[PDB]
Write a protein that holds these residues in place. Structure first.
Motif, PDB file in Angstrom:
ATOM      1  N   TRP A 287       0.897  -1.156   0.000  1.00 19.05           N
ATOM      2  CA  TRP A 287       0.000   0.000   0.000  1.00 19.05           C
ATOM      3  C   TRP A 287       0.930   1.198   0.000  1.00 19.05           C
ATOM      4  O   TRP A 287       2.147   1.024   0.237  1.00 19.05           O
ATOM      5  N   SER A 288       0.398   2.408  -0.252  1.00 19.07           N
ATOM      6  CA  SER A 288       1.241   3.613  -0.105  1.00 19.07           C
ATOM      7  C   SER A 288       0.419   4.842   0.252  1.00 19.07           C
ATOM      8  O   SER A 288      -0.793   4.741   0.491  1.00 19.07           O
ATOM      9  N   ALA A 289       1.092   5.999   0.320  1.00 20.16           N
ATOM     10  CA  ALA A 289       0.389   7.260   0.589  1.00 20.16           C
ATOM     11  C   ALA A 289      -0.114   7.914  -0.704  1.00 20.16           C
ATOM     12  O   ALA A 289      -0.778   8.955  -0.645  1.00 20.16           O
ATOM     13  N   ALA A 290       0.184   7.314  -1.863  1.00 19.64           N
ATOM     14  CA  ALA A 290      -0.135   7.945  -3.149  1.00 19.64           C
ATOM     15  C   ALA A 290      -1.627   8.206  -3.340  1.00 19.64           C
ATOM     16  O   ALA A 290      -2.442   7.272  -3.237  1.00 19.64           O
ATOM     17  N   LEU A 291      -1.966   9.469  -3.650  1.00 15.89           N
ATOM     18  CA  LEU A 291      -3.291   9.841  -4.151  1.00 15.89           C
ATOM     19  C   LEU A 291      -3.289  10.156  -5.665  1.00 15.89           C
ATOM     20  O   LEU A 291      -4.351  10.490  -6.239  1.00 15.89           O
ATOM     21  N   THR A 292      -2.110  10.067  -6.305  1.00 14.49           N
ATOM     22  CA  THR A 292      -1.965  10.207  -7.774  1.00 14.49           C
ATOM     23  C   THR A 292      -1.033   9.116  -8.327  1.00 14.49           C
ATOM     24  O   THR A 292      -0.318   8.462  -7.549  1.00 14.49           O
ATOM     25  N   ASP A 293      -1.021   8.953  -9.661  1.00 17.08           N
ATOM     26  CA  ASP A 293      -0.026   8.148 -10.360  1.00 17.08           C
ATOM     27  C   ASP A 293       1.006   9.062 -11.077  1.00 17.08           C
ATOM     28  O   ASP A 293       1.489   8.748 -12.179  1.00 17.08           O
TER      29      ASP A 293
END
Length: 394
Positions: A287-293
Motif C-alpha cells: 500500500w502507499s500514501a499515493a493519491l496520484t499516479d
C-alpha cells in the motif's frame, strides 16, 4: 517465531533492491536518454542488463546492491518501531533460462539481510517477485509487456526455483527470522487460466511441507474478489499455516483517481471491514500514501500519468508537476496525505497488519517511508493520530 492471531505486522517492503524498478531508481535508467527523447531507455531489468552486457551490468549492480539497503537501514527500521520487512527477489537470482541476460549475486546480499534482521529482532517474508516469461507484464516482474508464465515449461521452472527457496530459507537455519514464503507476486488473474494458477499454488504448498518446513505459505490474491480464496488451502482439508496477501491502492484507474478525499478514506475503511469477514489470515503486503499516479515512470518508462489524462484513456483530473516534490506541496495536499495514511493504518491493523511500499526511493515522495516520516506525514510513533477514529471499527 510468529502469531498471526494476536500480533500485528508493522512493516516495509525492501523494493527496488534485487529487482530494478525505473520509478524507484531513475538514475540507473536516465543516462540512456538523449535530450527529451525517451525512446532509447531500456524499459526493465531484462533489457537494462541486455544493453550493458554481463561485465558492466555486474559492476553497476554490485554498487547498487551494497549501498541501496544496508545493515544501518535495518537498525533505522527497528528504531522507528517497525517489526517486519518484505523482500522481493527475481527467479534469476537462482536459475537462468538458456538465453537470459540477467546477472547473479543477489543471494549473497539476501543472506546478509537475514542476519541483519536477526540482529535487530525483525521478521521477514521472502517474495518471489518475478517468474520466467512473466506472470503479469509489469516492469517489476523483470520483463514488461509479456505474459508467458503459463507457456511451455515456465511454470515447472518456477516450481523448481521455489523448491530451492524452500530448502535454503524454509528450514531450521532461518526459522527464527522467516515468517513467510510468498509463492508469486501479483499473478495477473484476469489474463491467466485460474485453474492452472490454483494447481501451481497447491503444488508449491505441498512441496514446501514435504521438505519438513513449518513456514507459513503466503499467496497473493491475484486481483480476485474478497472471499474468492475462502475454500482454497483450508484447515478443513489438512492445509495449515496459510496467509493471503492483499495489495491496496487508489491510483491505477481514472475512477479511483477522480475520488475526493472523503471518498478515498471511505474506500480505505471499507478495505478493513471486508478483510475482517474473510476466512484466511490476511495482511496488506503493499500500500502507499499515493493519491496520484504522478511519480515519473510509475506506469513504465516512456509512459505518462492517468491523473493528467496522459495514460490508459483516463480523462484529465489534475496536473502532475506541482506534486513531484514534497517541498512544493500545498497545505491541503499535506493534510489530505496525513488523513489517508492514518485511515489505512487503522483499516490494516483491524486484521493481520501492513507493509508499506516502499522503505525508500530516489525522489518519489508518495512512495518513500523515510521521506514521509521525515516530513511529518507518516505517524511516528506509528500509533500517533492527528485524525483518530475516521473509520469507527467495532
Amino acid at each position: 517465531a510468529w502469531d498471526y492471531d494476536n500480533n500485528v505486522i508493522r512493516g516495509v517492503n525492501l523494493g527496488g533492491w534485487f529487482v530494478l524498478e525505473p520509478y524507484m531508481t531513475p538514475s540507473l535508467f536516465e543516462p540512456f536518454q538523449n535530450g527529451n527523447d525517451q525512446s532509447g531507455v531500456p524499459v526493465d531489468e531484462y533489457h537494462w542488463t541486455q544493453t550493458l552486457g554481463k561485465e558492466a551490468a555486474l559492476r553497476i549492480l554490485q554498487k547498487h546492491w551494497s549501498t541501496w539497503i544496508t545493515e544501518q537501514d535495518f537498525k533505522q527500521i527497528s528504531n522507528l518501531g517497525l517489526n517486519f520487512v518484505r523482500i522481493p527477489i527475481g527467479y534469476w537470482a537462482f536459475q537462468l533460462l538458456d538465453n537470459d541476460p540477467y546477472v547473479q549475486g543477489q543471494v549473497q546480499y539476501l543472506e546478509k539481510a537475514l542476519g541483519w534482521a536477526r540482529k535487530n529482532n525483525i521478521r521477514v517474508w521472502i517474495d518471489l517477485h518475478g517468474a520466467p516469461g512473466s506472470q503479469n507484464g509489469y516492469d517489476n516482474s523483470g520483463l514488461r509487456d509479456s505474459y508467458n508464465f503459463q507457456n511451455g515449461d515456465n511454470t515447472q521452472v518456477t516450481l523448481n526455483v521455489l523448491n530451492t527457496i524452500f530448502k535454503k530459507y524454509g528450514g531450521n537455519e532461518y526459522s527464527d527470522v522467516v515468517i513467510g514464503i510468498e509463492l508469486l507476486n501479483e499473478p495477473l488473474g484476469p489474463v491467466l487460466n485460474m485453474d492452472k494458477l490454483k494447481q501451481f499454488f497447491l503444488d508449491g504448498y505441498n512441496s514446501l511441507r514435504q521438505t519438513g518446513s513449518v513456514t507459513p505459505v503466503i499467496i497473493h490474491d491475484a486481483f480476485q474478489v474478497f472471499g474468492y480464496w475462502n475454500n482454497f488451502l483450508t484447515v478443513a482439508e489438512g492445509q495449515w499455516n496459510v496467509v493471503v496477501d492483499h495489495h491496496h491502492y487508489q491510483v491505477y484507474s481514472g475512477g479511483e483517481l477522480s475520488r475526493n478525499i472523503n471518498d478515498h478514506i471511505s474506500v480505505a475503511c471499507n478495505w478493513g471491514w471486508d478483510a475482517k469477514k474473510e476466512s484466511h489470515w490476511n495482511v496488506a503486503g503493499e500500500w502507499s500514501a499515493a493519491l496520484t499516479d504522478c511519480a515519473k515512470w510509475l506506469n513504465g518508462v516512456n509512459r505518462g500519468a492517468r491523473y493528467e489524462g496522459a495514460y490508459d484513456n483516463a480523462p484529465y483530473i489534475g496536473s502532475c508537476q506541482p506534486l513531484l516534490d514534497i517541498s512544493q506541496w500545498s497545505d491541503e495536499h499535506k493534510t489530505d496525505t496525513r488523513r489517508y495514511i492514518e485511515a489505512q493504518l487503522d483499516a490494516f491493523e483491524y486484521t493481520g497488519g501492513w507493509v508499506f511500499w516502499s522503505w525508500k526511493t530516489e525522489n518519489a515522495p508518495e512512495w518513500s517511508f523515510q521521506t514521509l516520516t521525515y516530513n511529518g506525514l507518516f505517524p511516528q510513533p506509528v500509533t500517533d493520530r492527528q485524525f483518530p477514529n475516521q473509520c469507527g471499527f467495532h
